[PDB]
């Protein structure tokens, strides 16, 4: 079954024994899930358990070469959504996307890779708009990057807290 | 008794990175070289890559040439599967041919998957180039690639 990866992670991140919860340590660092997707439409959820002052998260999708010692969205291998101001990040360019998210929010992550690629982010079930289209081809892993000591939990499915309306996908847990 | 094949396989995967390296070769271009003595019958390196069904090799050759990518780096496992290391692979891509080689290839099955592993045919000493016999099909006179392996029992051509 799908978990946060055992070796494919920054070492400084504090990951729970069940491997679904992760706490940040100092500068931005990243963990990928154990499974990735190449085609089709897929979904997973992240809950912000705790976001103390001066902490942040950049969440989204990463290819295997995305740098583990940088925020998600740092390089060409990943696309991210920042808790602060809801900025979307790719190749370290941050663009206007949505408003911010924080403690208690449940964030939804959709990707479609048709066999016209898209990445769409959700906040508590509400589509926040297409963030990126025609993305690089490759294998995309659910990915978490945290700036200091905040805490997030990832849900790969099959059951989601805020399953989006009028959106077809498979839960990431179908890869398990 | 001998070690179970999967245990020999992790040890290889764990230690091959520090025992071999790629350098310029007196035989041809770049080759794989020995950085620590290797005992006879030990695993040297896996020929790693994308494992494809044999039927897909034809489609992939024509694709590689259409993009003007140069030569393919495909090693056949058996009649049914091939390891394609053209775009995804490891340092085993660079092992040159020798008419008197110090390595050989062997297919091993680990957890229902097949792997090409290069084995030391004899004790190999650091600084030796690692080579095996390509065993190319005997080709006609029109396209016979000459051999530069530098041995005295050299066959003059790869095919």
């Amino acid at each position: 079954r799908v978990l946060l990866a055992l070796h494919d992670r920054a070492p400084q991140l504090k990951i729970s024994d069940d491997r679904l919860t992760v706490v940040g340590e100092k500068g931005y660092s990243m963990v990928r899930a154990s499974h990735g997707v190449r085609k089709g439409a897929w979904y997973f959820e992240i809950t912000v358990d705790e976001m103390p002052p001066d902490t942040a998260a950049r969440l989204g999708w990463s290819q295997p070469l995305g740098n583990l010692q940088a925020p998600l969205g740092y390089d060409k291998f990943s696309y991210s959504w920042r808790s602060k101001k809801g900025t979307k990040f790719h190749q370290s360019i941050g663009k206007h996307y949505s408003s911010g998210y924080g403690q208690g929010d449940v964030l939804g992550f959709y990707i479609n890779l048709p066999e016209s690629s898209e990445i769409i982010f959700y906040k508590n079930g509400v589509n926040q708009g297409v963030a990126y289209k025609d993305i690089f081809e490759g294998v995309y892993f659910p990915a978490i990057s945290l700036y200091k000591s905040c805490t997030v939990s990832i849900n790969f499915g099959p059951c989601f807290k805020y399953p989006p309306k009028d959106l077809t996908y498979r839960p990431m847990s179908d890869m398990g | 008794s001998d070690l179970p094949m999967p245990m020999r396989f992790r040890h290889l995967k764990k230690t091959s990175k520090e025992a071999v390296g790629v350098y310029r070769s007196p035989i041809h271009g770049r080759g794989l070289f020995c950085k620590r003595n290797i005992d006879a019958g030990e695993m040297v390196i896996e020929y790693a890559g994308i494992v494809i069904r044999s039927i897909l090799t034809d489609k992939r050759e024509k694709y590689y040439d259409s993009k003007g990518i140069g030569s393919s780096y495909m090693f056949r496992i058996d009649d049914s599967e091939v390891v394609d290391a053209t775009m995804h692979g490891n340092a085993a891509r660079f092992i040159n041919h020798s008419c008197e080689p110090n390595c050989y290839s062997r297919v091993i099955n680990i957890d229902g998957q097949k792997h090409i592993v290069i084995f030391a045919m004899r004790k190999i000493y650091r600084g030796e180039e690692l080579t095996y016999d390509y065993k190319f099909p005997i080709e006609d006179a029109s396209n016979k690639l000459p051999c530069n392996c530098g041995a005295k029992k050299c066959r003059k051509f790869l095919n």
Partner: peptide, 19 residues
């Protein structure tokens, strides 16, 4: 070529053989 440490099985598409 991207370096690889372990073999990867190609996952063919449904349309792998089509024009």
């Amino acid at each position: 070529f991207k370096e690889l440490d372990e073999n990867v099985e190609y996952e063919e598409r449904e349309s792998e053989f089509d024009i």
